[PDB]
Amino acid sequence: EILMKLLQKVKVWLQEYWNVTDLIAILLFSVGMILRLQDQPFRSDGRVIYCVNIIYWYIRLLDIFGVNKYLGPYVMMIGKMMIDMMYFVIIMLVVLMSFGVARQAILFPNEEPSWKLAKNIFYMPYWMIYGEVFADQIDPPCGQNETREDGKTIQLPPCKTGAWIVPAIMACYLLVANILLVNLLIAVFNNTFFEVKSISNQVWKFQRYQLIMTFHERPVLPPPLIIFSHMTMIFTDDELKKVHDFEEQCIEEYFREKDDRFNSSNDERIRVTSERVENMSMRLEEVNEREHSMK
Amino acid sequence: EQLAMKLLTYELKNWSNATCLQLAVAAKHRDFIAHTCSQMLLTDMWMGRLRMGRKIYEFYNAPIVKFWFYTLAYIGYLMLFNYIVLVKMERWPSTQEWIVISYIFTLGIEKMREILMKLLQKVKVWLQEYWNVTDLIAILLFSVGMILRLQDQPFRSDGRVIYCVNIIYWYIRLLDIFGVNKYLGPYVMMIGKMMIDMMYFVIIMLVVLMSFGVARQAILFPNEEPSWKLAKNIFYMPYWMIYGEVFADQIDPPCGQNETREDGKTIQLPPCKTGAWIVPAIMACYLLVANILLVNLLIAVFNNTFFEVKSISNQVWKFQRYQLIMTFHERPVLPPPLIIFSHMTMIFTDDELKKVHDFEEQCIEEYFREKDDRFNSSNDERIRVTSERVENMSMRLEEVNEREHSMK
Numbered sequence: 226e227i228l229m230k231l232l233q234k235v236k237v238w239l240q241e242y243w244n245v246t247d248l249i250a251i252l253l254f255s256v257g258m259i260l261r262l263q264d265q266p267f268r269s270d271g272r273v274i275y276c277v278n279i280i281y282w283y284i285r286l287l288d289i290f291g292v293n294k295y296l297g298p299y300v301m302m303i304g305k306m307m308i309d310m311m312y313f314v315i316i317m318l319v320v321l322m323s324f325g326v327a328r329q330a331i332l333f334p335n336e337e338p339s340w341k342l343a344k345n346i347f348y349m350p351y352w353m354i355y356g357e358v359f360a361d362q363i364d365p366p367c368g369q370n371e372t373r374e375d376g377k378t379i380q381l382p383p384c385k386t387g388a389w390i391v392p393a394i395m396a397c398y399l400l401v402a403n404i405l406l407v408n409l410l411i412a413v414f415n416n417t418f419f420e421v422k423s424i425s426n427q428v429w430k431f432q433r434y435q436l437i438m439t440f441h442e443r444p445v446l447p448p449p450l451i452i453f454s455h456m457t458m459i460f461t462d463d464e465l466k467k468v469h470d471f472e473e474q475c476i477e478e479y480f481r482e483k484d485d486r487f488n489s490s491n492d493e494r495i496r497v498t499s500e501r502v503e504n505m506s507m508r509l510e511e512v513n514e515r516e517h518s519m520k
Numbered sequence: 521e522q523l524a525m526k527l528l529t530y531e532l533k534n535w536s537n538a539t540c541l542q543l544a545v546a547a548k549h550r551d552f553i554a555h556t557c558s559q560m561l562l563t564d565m566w567m568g569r570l571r572m573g574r575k576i577y578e579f580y581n582a583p584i585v586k587f588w589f590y591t592l593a594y595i596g597y598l599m600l601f602n603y604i605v606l607v608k609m610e611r612w613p614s615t616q617e618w619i620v621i622s623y624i625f626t627l628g629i630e631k632m633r634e635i636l637m638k639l640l641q642k643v644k645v646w647l648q649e650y651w652n653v654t655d656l657i658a659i660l661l662f663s664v665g666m667i668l669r670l671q672d673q674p675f676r677s678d679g680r681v682i683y684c685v686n687i688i689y690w691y692i693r694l695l696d697i698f699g700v701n702k703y704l705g706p707y708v709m710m711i712g713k714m715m716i717d718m719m720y721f722v723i724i725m726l727v728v729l730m731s732f733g734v735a736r737q738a739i740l741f742p743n744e745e746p747s748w749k750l751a752k753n754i755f756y757m758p759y760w761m762i763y764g765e766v767f768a769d770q771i772d773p774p775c776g777q778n779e780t781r782e783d784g785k786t787i788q789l790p791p792c793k794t795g796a797w798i799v800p801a802i803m804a805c806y807l808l809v810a811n812i813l814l815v816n817l818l819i820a821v822f823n824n825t826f827f828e829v830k831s832i833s834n835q836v837w838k839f840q841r842y843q844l845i846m847t848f849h850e851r852p853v854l855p856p857p858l859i860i861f862s863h864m865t866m867i868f869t870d871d872e873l874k875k876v877h878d879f880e881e882q883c884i885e886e887y888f889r890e891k892d893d894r895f896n897s898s899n900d901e902r903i904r905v906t907s908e909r910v911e912n913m914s915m916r917l918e919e920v921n922e923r924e925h926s927m928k
């Protein structure tokens with residue numbers, strides 16, 4: 226398809242993003258296939274590459290759905306709302322990191338450097354958004370004299386210098402996140418929906434032509450079997466006068482109608498009436514004054 | 521465009537050499553600044569000479585690069601603060617903590633220099649902004665924490681917690697940095713305006729929460745001596761009930777019954793309480809009232825207020841842009857960590873004017889003539905004139921016709 230200067234063809238091809246993503250996915254699949262066949266230690270990596278790659282092909286069904294009348298605009302609307310999603314994400318991330326760092330620092334006062342800290346910063350607070358608050362770990366009893374049940378008494382730890390601040394910050398963070406920002410995003414979507422809808426519909430109606438022509442030019446067979454297709458590929462005046470007369474008549478009628486509509490405007494009538502009245506009044510006054518001599 | 525740009529800014533000996541933009545900003549017109557030409561001039565000043573020997577001076581004094589340097593320094597300081605708080609601390613501070621405290625105190629010194637430039641008027645104007653007040657409070661808290669940290673074991677753990685709680689304000693202060701962005705500044709103002717509706721919702725939510733908590737606590741634990749745990753228990757579970765944790769285990773335990781148990785000796789069940797089913801009933805009613813009604817009402821409030829707030833926020837940001845640009849124009853080149861050396865250094869044609877005036881006079885004349893022509897072209901003016909002349913003409917014609925009888 227790209228083969229049909231070459232730089233212009235490449236630029237036009239890159240104008241579309243689906244082709245770029247398809248090329249990237251095909252390259253990743255080739256890498257995975259090469260890794261799969263080379264002995265035991267590499268085969269498990271190629272399998273995971275396949276598993277992660279299948280997701281793009283699963284999602285590519287939106288391009289197929291684009292043809293549908295009632296379903297194409299949905300995809301464009303989602304694509305446009307992704308930007309507001311990102312803007313929400315930035316602030317959500319800032320608040321998330323603040324809360325996570327505070328929680329991690331308040332607890333575990335002594336701990337040597339390691340990479341687990343970064344994971345712990347993000348782990349719990351992100352899941353706190355979607356309804357999992359970890360009720361067990363909010364505020365454990367810590368130090369006390371507990372005899373336990375059905376077992377020997379277990380001496381409780383000595384607690385930490387400050388922990389109640391952790392529940393306080395948790396409450397504040399949940400209040401800020403689960404209520405304010407999400408509802409603000411809902412309002413943004415509600416405001417932008419009407420503006421985006423008509424534009425998306427018109428743009429889809431325009432892209433319909435290119436879709437139809439692309440499917441008109443393609444070979445009959447599908448990709449699995451078009452290898453044979455590739456092998457084959459490498460191997461009246463009166464009517465025109467009537468149309469012109471019709472067009473000329475239409476032009477004349479349209480111009481005449483436009484002129485008549487402009488003349489029918491009340492502004493034109495008012496202007497003409499005022500001009501004639503002013504001229505007529507002056508002429509009448511002169512006649513009346515001149516009539517005195519006749520008298 | 522060039523004539524407008526020239527007319528906008530040029531020193532006037534008549535008005536103490538003050539340009540039009542300065543007067544408009546001081547007047548707080550809020551619409552002269554937002555005009556496209558003014559925004560273009562502000563952007564041109566923002567990018568300085570590089571509107572893409574002398575390079576070292578011009579490039580490094582442009583506001584934009586100084587802004588980026590300040591941002592990078594702030595980000596690095598934040599990273600060091602995070603590393604410090606996460607990792608354990610010995611009796612004496614490390615290099616990172618020295619760098620952090622030096623940054624904090626240099627920032628305080630910079631604030632003092634800025635306020636120093638009567639003194640009461642300066643203080644009032646400074647307090648007009650809230651970010652400076654919050655920064656001062658945070659710096660004082662950090663100083664308290666630093667003093668507490670160094671005084672023996674029992675106090676050091678308190679200073680560490682002070683640091684941990686303080687870092688949050690610096691984390692949140694990135695909104696001021698984001699304020700410069702075109703598409704992101706208005707978001708912050710919108711959030712600030714919605715906080716009020718948040719508070720109004722909070723009051724009623726708190727009332728209902730307290731009612732339910734007190735009812736639950738009183739129905740259970742009929743006998744219990746006074747203590748502070750009751751206040752905590754009033755608030756604990758019901759607040760978390762909002763966000764999807766209902767504590768299914770504790771809704772309605774079996775209480776009294778003959779249970780043989782499993783894989784163990786039979787455990788005699790307690791004798792229950794006088795009334796418990798009322799607790800599930802009240803829980804259901806409270807959840808219905810809270811998780812559905814009030815939240816959706818708040819959603820509706822936000823939807824209604826969003827459009828009203830959006831345009832005002834955009835205009836206000838466009839106005840504040842000028843002060844932002846000038847503030848970054850006046851600041852020193854170096855960022856806070858290294859401006860101690862900066863502080864040490866600091867302590868140590870007529871024809872064109874006639875053409876502009878002629879252009880302005882021509883514009884005034886043209887505008888007034890156009891306004892007069894537009895007013896005269898109004899249909900009301902034509903209708904009024906036509907009626908007046910017709911009435912006068914009709915009366916004159918009637919008199920002539922009556923007088924014509926004598927001639928006959």
Ligand SMILES: CCCCCCCC/C=C\CCCCCCCC(=O)O[C@H](COC(=O)CCCCCCCCCCCCCCC)COP(=O)(O)OCCN
Pocket residue numbers: 241242243246249250277280281284287300301303304
């Ligand atoms: C290491 C971990 C990686 C994480 C992998 C992702 C996790 C899988 C689960 C969920 C992923 C869902 C991602 C949401 C995708 C939304 C895309 C969408 O609807 O917007 C579309 C945007 O269209 C585009 O521009 C094409 C962009 C598609 C890229 C999607 C890639 C996501 C899949 C990741 C898998 C990894 C391979 C990716 C290779 C690039 C629809 O708009 P349009 O009108 O058709 O514009 C076409 C312009 N000519």
Ligand SMILES: CCCCCCCC/C=C\CCCCCCCC(=O)O[C@H](COC(=O)CCCCCCCCCCCCCCC)COP(=O)(O)OCCN
Pocket residue numbers: 320323324390393394397398401649650651654657658685688689692695708709711712
């Ligand atoms: C003892 C326990 C204390 C609890 C600590 C808080 C818990 C930490 C987790 C989450 C905190 C999130 C708080 C939400 C902050 C929202 C602020 C916001 O976006 O509104 C802003 C309002 O702007 C302002 O007026 C500045 C006010 C900022 C104060 C924020 C302080 C909260 C942090 C608390 C930390 C303790 C130190 C505080 C010291 C005062 C944006 O509006 P603006 O247009 O820029 O107005 C500027 C006027 N010139």
Ligand SMILES: CC(C)CCC[C@@H](C)[C@H]1CC[C@H]2[C@@H]3CC=C4C[C@@H](OC(=O)CCC(=O)O)CC[C@]4(C)[C@H]3CC[C@]12C
Pocket residue numbers: 314317318321344347348351
């Ligand atoms: C505000 C938006 C942008 C959300 C961003 C949050 C993500 C960056 C967080 C949420 C959950 C996190 C993950 C939680 C757990 C892990 C496993 C971790 O790998 C291991 O734990 C090694 C094996 C082991 O030791 O158990 C690598 C990071 C990852 C994917 C974390 C990386 C960052 C994630 C994806």
Ligand SMILES: CC(C)CCC[C@@H](C)[C@H]1CC[C@H]2[C@@H]3CC=C4C[C@@H](OC(=O)CCC(=O)O)CC[C@]4(C)[C@H]3CC[C@]12C
Pocket residue numbers: 338339340342343346598599602603606
């Ligand atoms: C946007 C800003 C706030 C940056 C993000 C804040 C933190 C999540 C980042 C910033 C720098 C990071 C640190 C960079 C260097 C190190 C040391 C390094 O630990 C080791 O050297 C030991 C390696 C091992 O034994 O595995 C890895 C974690 C840590 C603390 C990183 C963990 C997370 C930190 C504190």
Ligand SMILES: CC(C)CCC[C@@H](C)[C@H]1CC[C@H]2[C@@H]3CC=C4C[C@@H](OC(=O)CCC(=O)O)CC[C@]4(C)[C@H]3CC[C@]12C
Pocket residue numbers: 364365366389390392393396722725726729752755756759
């Ligand atoms: C409607 C809006 C305004 C929500 C307001 C609710 C908050 C005032 C509640 C929710 C969770 C409560 C916290 C839950 C647990 C604790 C720990 C408690 O400290 C202890 O328990 C001492 C140590 C111990 O005995 O275990 C101090 C109060 C605090 C922060 C509670 C105080 C009040 C909080 C923040």
Ligand SMILES: CC(C)CCC[C@@H](C)[C@H]1CC[C@H]2[C@@H]3CC=C4C[C@@H](OC(=O)CCC(=O)O)CC[C@]4(C)[C@H]3CC[C@]12C
Pocket residue numbers: 746747748750751754
């Ligand atoms: C807005 C209105 C409804 C006020 C809030 C209602 C309750 C949450 C407050 C009001 C008065 C408070 C009481 C004021 C005095 C005391 C006694 C005091 O207990 C002790 O004297 C023993 C101290 C100890 O042993 O620790 C602390 C709790 C209690 C019941 C307080 C707990 C919570 C109460 C009932």
